[model samples]
Target chain A: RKNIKLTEPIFNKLKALMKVKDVKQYELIEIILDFYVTNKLSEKEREFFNYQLEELRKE
Target chain B: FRKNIKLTEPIFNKLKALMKVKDVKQYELIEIILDFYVTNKLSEKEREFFNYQLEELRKEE
Candidate 1:
């Protein structure tokens, strides 16, 4: 497994959230990222989407 | 418009690792997911929406 380091408060909150949701860290991240996208993480999300489209086109 | 996609722990973690190592954006992952989804299950509205957005994006490109 690869290693990651989180800030203390984020670490605590993330661990607590995973425990509450009964999911692992990666699963929790997917949920939150999906929420962010649905909620329009807005321009940033679209920018990344455009970049992705270009990458796909090149593939 | 979006719906939930359930990924098994192993698959999700594997995707996570790939994204991290490749430095890929989450939007790329979502686009790939949508691509896979529309192959077998394309709703009229979603098809229209995706097509419209893709066209608009291309115009901007």
Candidate 2:
């Protein structure tokens, strides 16, 4: 196992969340990071999305 | 200050690569990522996409 340090509250919250989700800590983290690495928005998508939001807000 | 947490090698390696790219420490990055996930900050479109992906990941497990 590789070691990392986490603050108490976040760790507690994470622990609680894992329990509810019925996932191991590493598995939960793997899913999260993998999702992010694969799916984070590209610059063009971000720009268009933001523009859409701006237009909606103006109405 | 932080408490120790142990992670498996593959997950640890992914976190390390993220640290290099995001220029954040492992602990801090974990907090950010987890918070974003748990707090439901992702837009509806993102959430739908993630749910589909999540199912695929589970199928592989």
Candidate 3:
């Protein structure tokens, strides 16, 4: 896997989280990303996205 | 198939701030996240394929 570069503070924060969650950094990363994305994109957004993709998907 | 990823609140808030600077969709966000962490896992042929797309991007951009 590719390596991630983080500020010392952010890496330290994740390092602590890695131990606290008892999960690898990647696992933790996925979790955080999912959470951040879940509420950020509502169903409407996805419906719109699907409509947008459908246009590209078909033609 | 789609599935959820689990994470803790504290860790999430931190990551939330980091990535929120960009206006991005979940799909693009995940692609970016995977690009950051998964590109190295690709096979040489796959890397070539991805790099080709990147070349197209550079040309178009």
- The estimated TM-scores of all candidates read 0.39, 0.61, 0.37
C-alpha positional error of residue A10 in candidate 2 after TM-score superposition, expressed in Å: 1.7
RMSD, each candidate, Å? 16.4, 13.6, 16.9
How would you encode candidate 1's per-residue C-alpha lDDT over B1-61 as one tens digit per residue?
1223345544455345435434545446544433444443445765566466555544653
Q: Write the per-residue lDDT of candidate 3 for residues A1-30, one digit (tens) a residue.
A: 123345343333444344434567666676
Clashing pairs in 2: none
* Cα error of candidate 1 at position B52, Å: 46
Q: How do the residues B1-61 of candidate 2 rate in per-residue lDDT, one tens digit apiece?
A: 5567788766676676666556677777887777667556456665555556555545654
Which sequence of candidate numbers ranks them by DockQ, best first?
Answer: 2, 3, 1
State the C-alpha lDDT per candidate: 0.48, 0.65, 0.47
Ten contiguous residues minimizing lDDT sum, candidate 2 chain A: A48-57
Per-residue lDDT for B33 in model 1?
Answer: 36
Tens digit per residue, CA lDDT, model 1, A1-59: 33344334334444434444556656766665444344443576556644654554455
Per residue, candidate 2 scores C-alpha lDDT tens digits across A1-22 of 5578887756665665564465
